[PDB]
Design a protein around this ligand. Sequence first.
Ligand SMILES: *[C@@H]1O[C@H](CO)[C@@H](O)[C@H](O)[C@H]1NC(C)=O
Length: 421
Amino acid sequence: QFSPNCSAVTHIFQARGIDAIEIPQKPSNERVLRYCESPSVGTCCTYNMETRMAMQSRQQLEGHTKDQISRMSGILGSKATKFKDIFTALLKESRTQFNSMFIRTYGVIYERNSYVFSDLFKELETYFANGRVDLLEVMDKFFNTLYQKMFTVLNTQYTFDENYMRCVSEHMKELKPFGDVPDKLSVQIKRSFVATRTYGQALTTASEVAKKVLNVRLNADCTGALTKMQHCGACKGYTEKPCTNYCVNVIKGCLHYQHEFDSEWENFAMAMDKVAERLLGSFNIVMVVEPLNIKISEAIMNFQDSGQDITNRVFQGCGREPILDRIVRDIRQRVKDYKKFWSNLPHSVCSNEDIASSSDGMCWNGHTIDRYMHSITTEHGSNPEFTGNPASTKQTAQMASQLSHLKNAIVHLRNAYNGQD
Ligand SMILES: *[C@@H]1O[C@H](CO)[C@@H](O)[C@H](O)[C@H]1NC(C)=O
């Protein structure tokens, strides 16, 4: 082509931290630049100027992504902690209100068997804490104990002080003294606790795996493409900003190790929104305790119609909005905000003061001040600004465990949404 105009870009180099002593007044005829082009017509940059601007671009990109990722990780992590603390306190406050409510209502006959209810609450609190509880198993044993006690006081005419009660326990497993009320209540409680715990646990893991992405350093191939995009325009005497799509393609390649992680992050956000829909609707733990007295009345009505029938079959064979909804809505909206977080990073990087790429028109496309031919790439394993795969084997190996944990939480969210187990 023709010799570049180094006088038009002398202020740009000084703005990048390069002292005026290092800045060549006339184009340099040496051809030793690693990232910019060194044509026969010369260049306005030296090897030391290129190295300074190279490490500057890598630190600006790593700084911008570190601030974005850690702030998202911190917010989601603290909201998960607030969610768990609210439900944990709501659980303990319920055990007391439930005990006080039934003692004033049913009296000593409840307080005599209050241990059956406190043991159930203890299992429920333990499940939400560590998840090592079979909820349906605990619920079935809960009603089985109620089935046994309801059989003794019905037959106050007889004496059942014997430990032949195992036959009653074994026979009450297949019988339905209260109708379908215990089974319907056991499933709705199990679904609610699984969805509630998984919602907070998946949000915590997403915050943890997001924080671990900070451990992945940019590779040498990223440094080359980054400097050609952001700084090498001034080395040809050009003052225009890089083209937007050109900048986006470069940052996408620098951050290409996040490709799979970005797509699964969207799956995580969609599964979180489904569970949040359940928690605000059918699976809401308030929806199973608000109509609790009518469920008891139906159980008693079913026990008065089937009591004489079951006591004979046993002898045969024996002888204005809740704060829980507020934190769920808060998490749901913020997870909705961070849905496209990873694919938006290249667009976020290309919009700051450090790069400030031009949306055009006249912009630096890597070679000249002309139109950028390529479009924003969406491929997995290629990029127009990179020779081979922009993601190195070392980067994807660091992302492997974070990808596996994120996918693991998506399976639990989907299972919790359907409620099957
Ligand atoms: C080179 O840049 C200087 C600095 O603005 C300017 O004065 C001069 O006219 C430019 N030369 C050409 C040929 O455009």
